[PDB]
């Protein structure tokens, strides 16, 4: 629904190497458009969408410069974190960051995001007021006090309200040809044996974009989600995505059931039933 930008950043330390592995990935409307990786031949922010090619060389040197700053910031934080959690040297550890902003259909700031994780667990997050912080444990409380003192919240607030939103407009305008596209799901139903007098009906949705989609079964026209196996939406690898829902019904009474598929690319939802 709401347009969005995100920067997903990761730092991984490792035994032997003094420099940790840093990777930053940028998303516009959940579609990857830029990437930085420290282990690349010539580390810089690369375009990963065809519509980003039109940015000038000056744009890319600014972004690469910020990546270098973040590498240094992540390195220092990984070291502090190691001390906070009383961990031994020579190990391997992860520091993750999610930054970004949501826009309303009216094209302005809806919600701002800024949150960190350590070893894949929540560490600290900027609150929705963009003023206060939520620390997951005692380690993160030490970071909180330090950041409260320095006015770190204000800094990120100016980013999420300022440049995050301003630059999202430019990216949305430049690449609306590809971003606002919608490929409709081509759907069907398969029938498979499960046990004595019971059958698995599976509802397929294939070749759809964007990933947002809802599949539900129903009994006699009434929504049915009791014990519905619903798989994780997965990429086809050609731009589009795939998904299925399934339900276990009695043998002979399969006609009673129908699948329902909702997707923004359709003029109206698909209703399907397994036929011989």
């Amino acid at each position: 629904g709401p347009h969005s930008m995100r920067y997903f950043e990761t730092a991984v330390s490792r035994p032997g190497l003094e420099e940790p592995r840093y990777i930053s990935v940028g998303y516009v409307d959940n579609k990857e458009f830029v990437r930085f990786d420290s282990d690349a031949e010539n580390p810089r922010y690369e375009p990963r969408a065809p519509w980003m090619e039109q940015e000038g060389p000056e744009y890319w040197e600014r972004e690469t410069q910020k990546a270098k700053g973040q590498e240094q910031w992540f390195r220092v934080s990984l070291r502090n974190l190691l001390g906070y959690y009383n961990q031994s040297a020579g190990g391997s550890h992860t520091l993750q960051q999610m930054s970004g902003c949501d826009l309303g259909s009216d094209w302005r700031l809806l919600r701002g995001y800024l949150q960190f994780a350590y070893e894949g667990r929540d560490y600290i997050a900027l609150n929705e007021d963009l003023k206060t912080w939520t620390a997951a444990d005692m380690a993160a409380q030490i970071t909180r006090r330090k950041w409260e003192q320095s006015g770190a919240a204000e800094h990120y607030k100016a980013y999420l309200e300022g440049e995050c939103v301003e630059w999202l407009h430019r990216y949305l305008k430049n690449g609306n040809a590809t971003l606002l596209r919608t490929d409709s799901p081509k759907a069907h139903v398969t029938h498979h044996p499960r046990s004595k007098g019971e059958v698995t009906l599976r509802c397929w949705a294939l070749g759809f974009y964007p990933a947002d989609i809802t599949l539900t079964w129903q009994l006699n026209g009434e929504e049915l989600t009791q014990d519905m196996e619903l798989v994780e939406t997965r990429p086809a690898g050609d731009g589009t995505f795939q998904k299925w829902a399934s339900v276990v019904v009695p043998l002979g009474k399969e006609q009673n059931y129908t699948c329902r598929v909702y997707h923004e690319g359709l003029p109206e939802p698909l209703t399907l039933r397994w036929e011989p």
Partner: protein, 99 residues
């Protein structure tokens, strides 16, 4: 932490025998981000396997897509084998076309 990876193995297009296609291996919901994935045809490692760059989800967990060109037949088996530090030994998953 150590989160066990979830593995999905599926073809890009609806599968048909003798019809060139692409087999995906979508590993998700794992941590730490080091992982070893390899795809197999009749228990033999497939040489040309493309690997996407590694991302992570809104729940912090890492995911990756491995894929290779393949032509289904009735008899041939296809599989994805993953080693990850959260598992005692590598898990193999077999491509279920009938699914």
């Amino acid at each position: 932490m150590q989160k066990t990876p979830q593995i999905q193995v599926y073809s890009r297009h609806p599968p048909e025998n003798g019809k060139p296609n692409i087999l995906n291996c979508y590993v998700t919901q794992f941590h730490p981000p080091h992982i070893e994935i390899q795809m197999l045809k009749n228990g033999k490692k497939i040489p040309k396997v493309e690997m996407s760059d590694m991302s992570f989800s809104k729940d912090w967990s890492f995911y990756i897509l491995a894929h290779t060109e393949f032509t289904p037949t009735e008899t041939d088996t296809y599989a994805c084998r993953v080693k990850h530090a959260s598992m005692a030994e590598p898990k193999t998953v077999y491509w279920d076309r009938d699914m």
